[PDB]
Structure formats: structure tokens, C-alpha cells
Amino acid sequence: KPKLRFIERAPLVPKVRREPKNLSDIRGPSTEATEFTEGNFAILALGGGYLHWGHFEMMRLTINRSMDPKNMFAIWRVPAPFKPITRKSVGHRMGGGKGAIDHYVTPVKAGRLVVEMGGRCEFEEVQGFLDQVAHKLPFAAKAVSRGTLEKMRKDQEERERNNQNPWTFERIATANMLGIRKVLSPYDLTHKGKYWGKFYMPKRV
Amino acid sequence: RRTPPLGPMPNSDIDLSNLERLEKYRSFDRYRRRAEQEAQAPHWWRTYREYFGRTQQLLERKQA
Amino acid sequence: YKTKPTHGIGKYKHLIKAEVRAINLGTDYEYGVLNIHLTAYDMTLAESYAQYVHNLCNSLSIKVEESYAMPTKTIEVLQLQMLLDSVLTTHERVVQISGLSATFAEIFLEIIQSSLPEGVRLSVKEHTEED
Amino acid sequence: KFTRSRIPEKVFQASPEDHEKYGGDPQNPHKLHIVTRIKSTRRRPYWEKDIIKMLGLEKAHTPQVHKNIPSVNAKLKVVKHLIRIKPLKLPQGLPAEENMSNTCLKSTGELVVQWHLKPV
Amino acid sequence: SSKNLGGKSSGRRQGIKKMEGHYVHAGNIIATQRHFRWHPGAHVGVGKNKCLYALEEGIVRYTKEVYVPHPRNTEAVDLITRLPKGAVLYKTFVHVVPAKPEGTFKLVAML
RNA sequence: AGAGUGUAGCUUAAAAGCACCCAACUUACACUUAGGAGAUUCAAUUGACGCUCUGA
RNA sequence: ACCUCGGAGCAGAACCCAACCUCCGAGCAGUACAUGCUAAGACUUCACCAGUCAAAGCGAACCUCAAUUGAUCCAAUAACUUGACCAACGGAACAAGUUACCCUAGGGAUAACAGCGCAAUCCUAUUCUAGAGUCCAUAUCAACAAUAGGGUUUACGACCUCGAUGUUGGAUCAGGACAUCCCGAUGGUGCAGCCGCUAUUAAAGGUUCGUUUGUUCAACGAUUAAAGUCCUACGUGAUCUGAGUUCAGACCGGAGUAAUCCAGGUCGGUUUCUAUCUACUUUAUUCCUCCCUGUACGAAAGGACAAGAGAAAUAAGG
RNA sequence: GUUAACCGUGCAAAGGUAGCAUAAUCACUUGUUCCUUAAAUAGGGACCUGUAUGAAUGGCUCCACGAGGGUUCAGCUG
RNA sequence: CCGAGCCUGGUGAUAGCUGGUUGUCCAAGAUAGAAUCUUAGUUCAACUUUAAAUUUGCCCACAGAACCAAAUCCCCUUGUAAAUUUAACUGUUAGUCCAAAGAGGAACAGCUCUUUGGACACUAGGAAAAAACCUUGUAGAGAGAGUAAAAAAUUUAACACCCAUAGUAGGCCUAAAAGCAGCCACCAAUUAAGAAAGCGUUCAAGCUCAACACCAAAAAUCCCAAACAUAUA
Ligand SMILES: [Mg+2]
Ligand SMILES: [Mg+2]
Ligand SMILES: [Mg+2]
Ligand SMILES: [Mg+2]
Ligand SMILES: [Mg+2]
Ligand SMILES: [Mg+2]
Ligand SMILES: [Mg+2]
Ligand SMILES: [Mg+2]
Ligand SMILES: [Mg+2]
Ligand SMILES: [Mg+2]
Ligand SMILES: [Mg+2]
Ligand SMILES: [Mg+2]
Ligand SMILES: [Mg+2]
Ligand SMILES: [Mg+2]
Ligand SMILES: [Mg+2]
Ligand SMILES: [Mg+2]
Ligand SMILES: [Mg+2]
Ligand SMILES: [Mg+2]
Ligand SMILES: [Mg+2]
Ligand SMILES: [Mg+2]
Ligand SMILES: [Mg+2]
Ligand SMILES: [Mg+2]
Ligand SMILES: [Mg+2]
Ligand SMILES: [Mg+2]
Ligand SMILES: [Mg+2]
Ligand SMILES: [Mg+2]
Ligand SMILES: [Mg+2]
Ligand SMILES: [Mg+2]
Ligand SMILES: [Mg+2]
């Protein structure tokens, strides 16, 4: 079965306990599916964000349209939507308790691979529609091969090594050079300069 | 912060993937004995001890 | 404490598990829940045999999940020639066994055969039953 | 939550390069700091202010002497961004009783027990 | 409207009262809790609350010791039975290293 | 014909401690209580009988 | 809807910690009858009050449970003791609707009007090419989504003003934006011609009169080159109106025992100001007619631009 | 159940009768249709789920009268 | 000036509400929470002031504070100078933005609610003007001096030239489906050209391509300092 399977909106067994919107499932780099698992190409998420069912559907559909099912295949690397979201009814005053559940959404972080692709092909064949998908997506995203990813990583490493600027962000943070922790977050020791909220500045170091 | 242990932690060597193949103390007595043994050993974390604390003959015997 | 090096010295719940298929792979094999039905006419004898089997299992590092007994079937027979009744009874006792790797099972079977008591019968088959 | 920053001790270790850059040697380390304040205690946490007060650094640009020893160092670390730390180094011998009056702190941190106002 | 209503209970102010090294006179409460976070050790009693109190004058000390429960308390026993054959539970205790001697012999009179 | 050796099942035990067996509680196991059986292969650190392994 | 008490999360590692934040529960039950009497030393729900624990001793053996509760005074009682869904749960010994007939003291600490914030909703433009468009994603329309911008709506917020910032429409006068309804100049066309649709550029000039309607709107009639979208304190009441709407009178329906009430309906219902200061008080478009012509274009039906001539219309000035 | 005479079934003290009806009568509501206007959320006349009409809480006709509130022919008039 | 007259008195009625509360100078001085017909108020606590008695108080380092991140508590040294108690009081007990951890709401608000830390409600310098961002505090005179924070940078899409014959209108399927409706096969001739990768054909036909040769912007009174790429940090 080489085709993205149906990701149905909500779970089949819903959850009556309303979660609070912890946005730390968006913030920072993905602990989970960074590396590959039997798929040569992928869509790398270069930014945090929640994936609606609509987005999922779009991802499914476009790929299916522009897939060569005998020669290529596709995999989900993201679960089905599971974080619930409460919206109150249209135009209520503030308070009176927390609202009722509306829709379910998967959190994605930066560094995550959203969709994986493999089969008898080059990356040049797969780029076209994966790029489209990325564009469609609700964060910075990039159609990315294995090799390409590796190259990018290498470049990053080089940047980290090379720079003639004596003052890194990390050094300023950990040593607490300017009492600058009065400005910074406590997450800005692990994240460092690179991550701001859902946003991931890939250039800086 | 999250400092690593100074020496080896207890119950680290025995766990393994398969718990259900292992022998287990079906009794109390064995467990007690084990505990006693552990106590007797020194450890690195402070504790109660820190602050408070021929052949012929044999043959003959056998015959007897 | 967490920040201390002693953290989680009291941790015990990972040492306990407080919470069926037949997996025949390629070089590592498992029969799924084998029920050994010990059928006999003497109540005592079957029980004894079952006990022995259990002991053997224990010795051999094999799990014994269930060891129930089945009901005694009153086969009431008319000894035809003058009606002479003979209300016999057959007793079935089971000992379930899970994990078993290639070489062991045959050996076990052999052992069982060697040990078989006088006027008692076996049946080794899968779990899918309705008691 | 803003916090009382704990600084790892890999920060406080001099490399050979560092040594080359600055003056000091690892063996024969300076006994005493001249510790000058170069920043305000305002727009800062109370603990830092307290530390500053303890140090005797209420006036800015008005240098105090201190012992180069662990407890003092720790304190300094708490407010190290607020200050300029430079080693007290004495080219002539350290003050006797006859000199005492005639001294001069100078730039480049040196006590200088002969202080005349005549040129060479 | 808000379906949830009710949990407006204050904090119990529980925890350690006397940390390690603290000098402690007899009868003082060392630490208070629900569920044995800390256990009683040498010269440390227990209330009905599970609150630990000192039974002698001296220095409080905390220590990781081997847990071996009373055989009549059943759950613990069961747990022990369940464990694998090399493992020992371990638990945190509170001792009071007693300071003064129980008493001294002094001269009454020369009869 | 050569090599490794050699405390009863097993042991950085030195006649030990675990394993083990029969009963009685147990559906059975398990626990527990009562009992049971056991060993330095043999001659002054050396040699000669027992295995394991390799040849014919 | 909630109001007292308790456990878990928010509050990840000594305490503490909120919301009409998320979730579970309690207002007992069981066992005792030394659930006797005393008493060093501590904890404490951030006060007090209430709560908790407890060595030793004397006297006897050989508590479970997370919450499971209520002050004082009063009653009842020979005495020991016992009295509240005093649940608004630190409890006033016992009290209710209504007011547009209302009044007073305050409040911009708190609403309606307007501003301001924000932009969920709302509108616009791009990106993306699935899908419509006999075929053809881009003549035209356009799903899923993405990235921006706006501040026309409905809200949300409560920052200015309650020792008053006076409201819906209409009249009067209009300043402005352009996101162009007409008038001009282009590009594309599924543009032969006439009509169109769509995009660029253009804010010099213009953008009708009526029937109904308190109304903006809306429908309908007649036209028109066109009868733009919006902003300006939903422009403009010390310029006007007051038909609606914010009072006192009154009926119909309904609600209420009744007073009375209704983001129901309907008849009636006073709109004050002599200008102190600022500001200010004489700088061409468009339609139609005639020819061109019944030519170009089109197989026919039909049917033009430009160039030219003539008449009007409004606007400005006499 | 058969727009329903009718049937089956419940509750009630009785079960809104005559009449009149988009009314000065919750809302739906610019209800539908004929007259009236070139054009009618107005006015008149009809129809009737008025689910909140209705009988001295007075119901329904009607002669006169009304600075009451609506609609209107003609004439008239800044 | 009648929802119940007017006058005198009780009546200096009462007001948790508003307004007001008068010589000079100096000093210390900012908002954890509790109940409460209570949230426009108040008593206690907390902070604050004074006079006393005092002996430690802040800062802290090893060791230590549970099972199901940032930090904290505790804490000798050390750097310092005060904290605790006793006596006597009032007053604050309707707060704001900024950074950080969160919660509610739209991962809206100059929104609302907790915690940690700033700042403001106290002078000055900067960020255009500016409460809350930064630099900076203990005071007065000087026609002296060194500094602190402290001035925004960017300009963006050309692209190929040539040459295309054949087994073959592969079979299968299709009324017909010819490199291109759908499958199986994808072999093969000449230097070299896919059993064809875009269009295009009702099916054909023609066009290419693969191959040889050749070498970012839009809103409403009127843009908004003026201006400037070149003499040495
Ligand atoms: Mg709680
Ligand atoms: Mg609370
Ligand atoms: Mg207290
Ligand atoms: Mg006692
Ligand atoms: Mg009350
Ligand atoms: Mg109360
Ligand atoms: Mg009235
Ligand atoms: Mg008034
Ligand atoms: Mg206000
Ligand atoms: Mg408003
Ligand atoms: Mg299509
Ligand atoms: Mg007002
Ligand atoms: Mg005024
Ligand atoms: Mg334009
Ligand atoms: Mg207006
Ligand atoms: Mg006006
Ligand atoms: Mg009148
Ligand atoms: Mg007027
Ligand atoms: Mg009506
Ligand atoms: Mg009229
Ligand atoms: Mg009259
Ligand atoms: Mg008064
Ligand atoms: Mg009040
Ligand atoms: Mg002062
Ligand atoms: Mg009360
Ligand atoms: Mg606010
Ligand atoms: Mg507020
Ligand atoms: Mg000064
Ligand atoms: Mg061709």
C-alpha cells in the first residue's frame, strides 16, 4: 500500500478532559522524528506549528495526485490530530468557564520530518510536489533528501566552527556576561540563539 | 541540574528486558537475607553505619 | 533528592510488571499457550500427573499461567447382555504452557511419554476453547 | 521566572591563549583584587545590590581592595558584570610604616610607595 | 457557567521542618507529610499523620537505608515477593544522632 | 598419543552457603512447617586414577 | 452559576500562590468502650479563632479513615452532657417584591453614545495549482491551504470623559481616501462587428426625480453617461428638524396575587444659549443629433471608431 | 392514527361557545389575494395555526358627535 | 420645586460618599496575605516610623531535602553590619507597564489572572515627544575635567544553438485507438535518436524534448528635519 493513508479528524475515542494549551509542544527543536526510517526523501519542518486536519488532507491529496504508486511510496511521520482545542461560541464575554472542544491538532516542532518518501527515483523527481506541500504548510518547511539534509548539517557545523566573531550567543548566556539572563528565557540556554518561539532562525549561530 | 551517581546504583545490573524469566524472591526470608547483606556492604551514600557504628580429624568426626 | 547523585535509589516500579498468539519467526520460535488435557478415570491419578507436569515445568524455567480442571463427565452405560448399570466418570485436568524454543518441546514431549501413568491419556493443543 | 543565575565552572578556567592575552601566570597568582564598580545597582535584582553593598562598591569608579580567595570570588561572580576586576601588583615592596602616607593607586593597578610630583 | 467547582483548599504547609545537621530537642517535629516521603529511623517516632518527631536531643541526619517491612503489613510483603531475586528496595530515613550522654555519676556525699 | 584440569547441581566458600527431594497445608504452583540425602578421585607443593578437548 | 470542607493539575526539585481555570470527591461509615487521667517538647492552612502531633509519668493491656464539619450568647439538663442544609456554611435571634412618580450621595474605580486597543468575525491582494471552463489549471471562475494588508460590520476590552463628550435618520454645507459607478488613456479576451467580461493607470469633472417606508437599508416606477465604496465624533443639532428614540399619560397581547414589568405592539409628549478666543468670509465638463454610412467589420442578422459640423444640458462668471 | 367528519387514548372543574380576526392584539410579518398608486413596509375589502382573539377584563353591529389617530377625491396654494 | 405641604424644634441628624483641611527646615518611609451583609470599607497579619534591650543578621560550601527545567531550602567559612526581642503608634490593606514561567481568551488586546525579577508612582541623561525600555541615584556653589546610555540597514528573476531517418500503424485491448485512452513488454538498424518526456491529433498528421553532428503593494486635513556615497577612530 504505497499511498498516504486516511488521517481522520479527531480520535475515534474522544477525550472529555480539556487540556490547557501548553505551547511548549511547539517551542524549540523536535526530540522525536528527526532522523529517517526507510524513506530517502522527506518534508523537513523548519518551524514549530499545529497541523489542522485540513493541512493533513492537503498533504495526502497532493502527494497522491503526483505519486507514481508502482515506482514510489509515502509515509506519515506525524501522528493523527490529538491535542484538542476549545473555542467558545461566537461573541461571548470573557469568563464563565473554559469553552467546549472544537477541533483536534498535532503539534509539530522544528527539526521534525512531516512526510517521508521512497522508491525507485531521484530527489529531482520528488522535489516538485513536496515543495508545493511545504509551501502549503503552516510553518517554515523544506523538501529535503537524505543527502541534502546531511549537507545542510555539515554547513551548520562549519558555521559553528568557522565564525571569526569571538562572541557566541551560548558563551554570553551560560557565563551570564551582562546579567543578560534578566532579558533571556531559561530555555535560551538549550535552544540558544537559534530558536525564538515557534520560529527557528537557521542562519544564525 | 541532574548529577550522575558517584559509584554504581543498586538494582541496576539485574533489571534487563525480560523481568518474567527471572527467579524472584517468592518468600520474605530470602528478601530479608538480601537486605541484611546489602546493609553489611559499605555503599557511597552515607548511612546508619556512618553516623552510629585435619583430614584425619574430619574422617574421625564423620565416623563418630 | 533529584539534583543529588542518589536520585531514584527507591525506584522499584520498573522492577515489577503490574499490568494469545503463536510467534514462529525464522530462527527463534514460540508455541502459543498449549493446553495439556490429562484425561483419566481415577480422580487421584490425573491430579498426580498434573502436579508432576507442573513441577517439571517449574524446574525447566517454563511459565504455567493456568492449571484449571474440567468437569467430570458422567458416562452412564448399560451393560447389555439383564440391565447392569455402571456409572463411570472421566476427569480432564489441564496445565497451560506458553514459551517454548525449537529444541525444548520435543524433549518435553519425550519426558511426558516416559512419565505417562497407568490408564491416563493426553491431548496437547491450542488455547481457543470455551469453558 | 527570572532567577539567581548559577554559572558553571568551565567558564572560570584560564586557557594558555587566555594567559597569553592577559598578564597573569597560573603559578604565583595575585593575592589581591582592585575591584571597581562600572555599572549601577538600579535596574537589577536586590541580591546583586546587596552583594555590591557588602563589597563596599556604592560609589562607582572608586576602587576597593579585596582578597583573591574563594568566598570573595563567589561574591564577585554574583555581580561580575557590574564591575572591573584587576590585580593589585606591587613593583616596589609593599608599604612599610615610613611610606604609608606616600602611596598612589594609578591606572594599570600598582600601589607605588614612592610618590613624588617631580618628573624623571 | 463552569462545570468544575469545589477545589478551593489551601496548602497544608507540610514538608521538612528540620533539615540535616539541625540541632533538635526532644519532642520537636522533624518533618510532616501524607504518604511516607521520609521514614522514621533512630530516635524518631511517628504520629497518626505520619509526621516524624524527635525522641532525643541531638543532630538530625538523613540517610538512604534498606527497606524491610513488617510481615503483618501485607501490601509491602506482596511487593517484595513480586521483586526479582537480586533487588533491594531502599528508602530515605531520618535519624537523630543523640548529643549528650543519658547521664553522669556525681558525688552525693562522703558517708 | 598430546593439552586443560579434578569441593555433591553451582561458587574471587573454607567440609560452607545456596540449589535438591518426601510429607502436611495447598485445585495445583507458591509460601510456610516438619523431615531427608548428600561430597576434596588416591599416595608423599610433587606423582598416579577420573573426566573435557584434539588426533589415529 | 457559585458561596463551607478535602485530594490532583496549573505550581516539574523547602513552604506559599489566582481566575465564573481544568478534574475528582465530603457533609460519613466501621471497629472500640482505658475513644482513662495527666504532661516535657514541637507543627500550623500565611492574623486571630479554630486546628495537628507527642516523649516521660500515673492508671491499664500483654483506633481505621483524605474531607466526614459550625463560634458566642441563649435554650434543654440533678449532673455528665445535647442542641442549627445558623450550607450566604467566622453564623445579624427573626424580614419581601417593586418604582418609567421617584429622590440623595458618589463613580468614567463600572455600562449605553463616540474615540482608543485588538482584529476572532469582516473585506482586499498575492502565493499554490486541485477542479470547472467540447480540449485547455492562469479568457473567466475557483477548492484545500499559505503570506501579507485594511480597519466599512458584529463583537471582545474597559484606557479618556457620569461638577454631561447630547443619539437614529433627513435638511444644509460638504473636506477627504480610492479599493473607479460614469467620463479619459492602455493590456488580455472564450475581442470579427455591435455588446461584453477581466487587468493596468487616472480622483481635473460628475454621480437624477419619485411611491412605500421614522429609517440607514430594501422593494417598485420613471429615467440616466452614471445613478460608485467608504471615511470624516456611524462628517455636520451654540445651523435646522426630532418622524423614530431616552422620561412622566394611556390602551391590546402576555408575565406577575399585586405594585408593576416586556432588548412586544400602538396614540400623546417643552430641543436653552447675546460668540470671549482660534479658524475662516471674491483664485469647464457631459449627453444627443447630422454627416462619415448604412462605409470599415460580417456569409446574413446586424453594425463601428477616429476626423468634421450642429444643437442642447449642467457647472462657473456676468 | 383514518385537510380531516371518524376512530383509539389520556388527563381536567370546564375544556374557549357565539362572534370577530394579520386588529391600537409576542413573534413569524413586506402573511395571502381584490380595489386604490405609473410606483403603496400606507388605506379599504376579503381569506384564517389568534398556539398569546373572545363575551359587563364585556363580544359583535350601528345613528349622531370628536382640536382623538389613520387613509382619500376635488379645489387651493411659495 | 406634593409619591405626600410649609414653618420651628429634636438637628452641630447621619453620611464606609465627594469636596476641603492654612509658618519654615531636615530626616526614616511603597502596596505577601485574613476574615468580613465584605471587596468604595475594616480588624488582624505583612511592610513602614520612633524609643529601648540586644546578639547575632544578611552573604553563604561540603554534606543533606520521594516514590509515583530555570532555580529553591538548608548552610560553616568569608565580605560585611546589623537582625531579633521589648515598649508605643499610626498609615498602606481599589496599583501600572517591561523581561521570564504559566493559566483563561483568538498561541487578540494598552485584555484578564497567578508566580519570579525589574522599573514607575522620587532627581537627571538617552530612546523624536514618552510612567513602566536603557544609563544613572545621597543632593550645595564653580564661566573646570573624564565618562555612561545614547544616530537603522537594505535592492533584488536574460539565456541556450543545431537536428530528428528507419523493423513499427510494437503486440494485447479497442468501432478506431499508430511514441503518446489502459495494461503487459521496453527488444532493436544504421556514427546516433525513449517502443517515447511535454503539448497536439476523432484515429492519423504535424510541433517540440531526450540522441548524433557543431563547438511586492493600498486610506481617508498636508510628504515630513534639512541635507550628505571620497583628508585618515
Ligand atoms: Mg489545589
Ligand atoms: Mg487557595
Ligand atoms: Mg500560623
Ligand atoms: Mg506514655
Ligand atoms: Mg455571610
Ligand atoms: Mg463566610
Ligand atoms: Mg408609565
Ligand atoms: Mg443625583
Ligand atoms: Mg474608565
Ligand atoms: Mg465603546
Ligand atoms: Mg480541469
Ligand atoms: Mg458621562
Ligand atoms: Mg467641566
Ligand atoms: Mg487605482
Ligand atoms: Mg453624528
Ligand atoms: Mg456642535
Ligand atoms: Mg396632539
Ligand atoms: Mg436649537
Ligand atoms: Mg402580532
Ligand atoms: Mg403619503
Ligand atoms: Mg368633546
Ligand atoms: Mg457631618
Ligand atoms: Mg463601603
Ligand atoms: Mg529620605
Ligand atoms: Mg455575616
Ligand atoms: Mg492590564
Ligand atoms: Mg483592568
Ligand atoms: Mg553625586
Ligand atoms: Mg513531427
Q: Tell me if there are at least 3 CB pairs under 8 Å linking chains A and E.
A: yes
User: How crowded is residue A3: how many other Cβ atoms within 10 Å of its Cβ?
Assistant: 13
Q: How far apart are CA D56 and CA D50, in angstroms?
A: 10
Give the three cell numbers for residue C8.
531514584
User: How crowded is residue A136: how many other Cβ atoms within 10 Å of its Cβ?
Assistant: 13
Rounded to a whole number of angstroms, the distance from the CA of E1 to the nearest CA of chain A is 5
Every domain of chain E and the residues it spans: 5-111
Rounded to a whole number of angstroms, the distance from the CA of C15 to the nearest CA of chain E is 6
Q: How far apart are CA C28 and CA C90, in angstroms?
A: 38
Contact call for E66 and B35, based on CB within 8 A = yes
User: How crowded is residue B10: how many other Cβ atoms within 10 Å of its Cβ?
Assistant: 21
Q: Which helix (H) or strand (E) holds A49?
A: strand A49-51
Of the candidates A21, A41, A8, the residue with the CA atom closest to the CA atom of residue A113: A41
CA atoms within 13 A on the CB side of E90: 24
Q: How far apart are CA A121 and CA A104, in angstroms?
A: 35
The residue in chain A having the minimum alpha-carbon distance to the alpha carbon of residue E1 is: A96
Q: How far apart are CA B22 and CA C61, in angstroms?
A: 9
Collect residues with CB below 5 Å from ion ligand 2.
E 10
Across-strand partners of A113?
A: A44
Write the DSSP string, B14-40: S--S-STTS----SSHHHHHHHHHHHH
- Name residues whose C-beta falls within 8 Å of residue D106's C-beta, 6 or more positions apart in sequence: D112
Contact call for E68 and B26, based on CB within 8 A = no
Every domain of chain A and the residues it spans: 1-205
- Four-point Cα dihedral C33, C37, C43, C44, nearest 10: -60
Q: How far apart are CA A107 and CA A51, in angstroms?
A: 6
Write the DSSP string, A19-32: PP--GGGTSSB-SS
Every domain of chain D and the residues it spans: 1-117
Task: Report the length, in residues, of chain D.
Answer: 120
Q: Which residue has the cell 507540610?
A: E14
The experimental method behind these coordinates is cryo-EM
In Å, how far from its chain's centre is CA A179?
A: 32
Contact call for E83 and C9, based on CB within 8 A = no
Which residue out of E16, E65, E90 would a mutagenesis test of the C interface target, given it has the greatest number of C Cβ atoms within 10 Å?
Answer: E90
Q: Tell me if there are at least 3 CB pairs under 8 Å linking chains A and C.
A: no
Looking at beta carbons, which residues of chain A come within 8 Å of E3? 97
Give backbone dihedrals phi and psi of D64, rounded to 5 degrees, phi first: -115, 155
Q: How far apart are CA A145 and CA A61, in angstroms?
A: 21
Q: How far apart are CA A133 and CA A116, in angstroms?
A: 12
Which residues precede a break in chain D, with C-to-N distance above 2.5 Å?
none
CATH number listed for the domain at residues E5-111:
2.40.50.100
CB D115 within 8 A of CB D103: yes
Rounded to the nearest angstrom, the distance between the alpha carbon of C16 and the centre of ligand 8 is 77
Q: How far apart are CA B37 and CA B10, in angstroms?
A: 13
C17 and chain B: CB distance < 8 Å anywhere? yes
Instruction: Let me know if D34 is exposed, middle or buried by CB neighbors in 10 A (0-12, 13-18, 19+).
Output: buried
Task: Report the relative pairing of strands C120-121 and C124-125 from DSSP bridges.
Answer: unpaired
Looking at beta carbons, which residues of chain B come within 8 Å of C11? 11
Write the DSSP string, A111-179: T-EEEEEEES--HHHHHHHHHHHHHHSSS-EEEEEHHHHHHHHHHHHHHHHH---S--HHHHHHTTTTS
Q: Which of B1, B11, B21 sits opposite C3 (nearest CB)?
A: B1
Looking at beta carbons, which residues of chain D come within 8 Å of A174? 7-8, 11
Q: Is C32 in a helix, a strand, or coil?
A: coil
Q: How far apart are CA E46 and CA A201, in angstroms?
A: 57
CB C112 within 8 A of CB C97: no
On strand G, nucleotides with any atom < 7 Å from a protein CB are 1-11, 13-26, 40-46, 52-55, 63-66, 120-121, 127-130, 144-147, 154-158
Q: How far apart are CA C27 and CA C20, in angstroms?
A: 20
Of the candidates D77, D79, D88, the residue with the CA atom closest to the CA atom of residue D110: D88
Instruction: Let me know if A144 is exposed, middle or buried by CB neighbors in 10 A (0-12, 13-18, 19+).
Output: buried
Task: Report the length, in residues, of chain B.
Answer: 64
